């Protein structure tokens, strides 16, 4: 959906057909609907965290973002 609030979920052991569990860095996060059409992206493998993106997409852009959507994005500062 276009209006759909956030979900940030912790890393899990990998999906594989036989019983052999690889230690996968799994990150499942929503950033912004203005840049990506689905906010809620699953990556099992490379350690992606969209906090330096969502922080610079909020440092000044949050006042224009709040006119475009109600409070869909997580209110992040650069820290």
From TrEMBL:
Domain DNA-binding protein H-NS-like C-terminal, residue spans: 24-67
Record key words, sorted: Coiled coil
Domain of life: Bacteria
Transmembrane segments: none
GO MF entries: DNA binding
Keyword Transcription regulation applies: no
Protein name (record): Virulence regulator
Species this protein is from: Xylella fastidiosa (strain 9a5c)
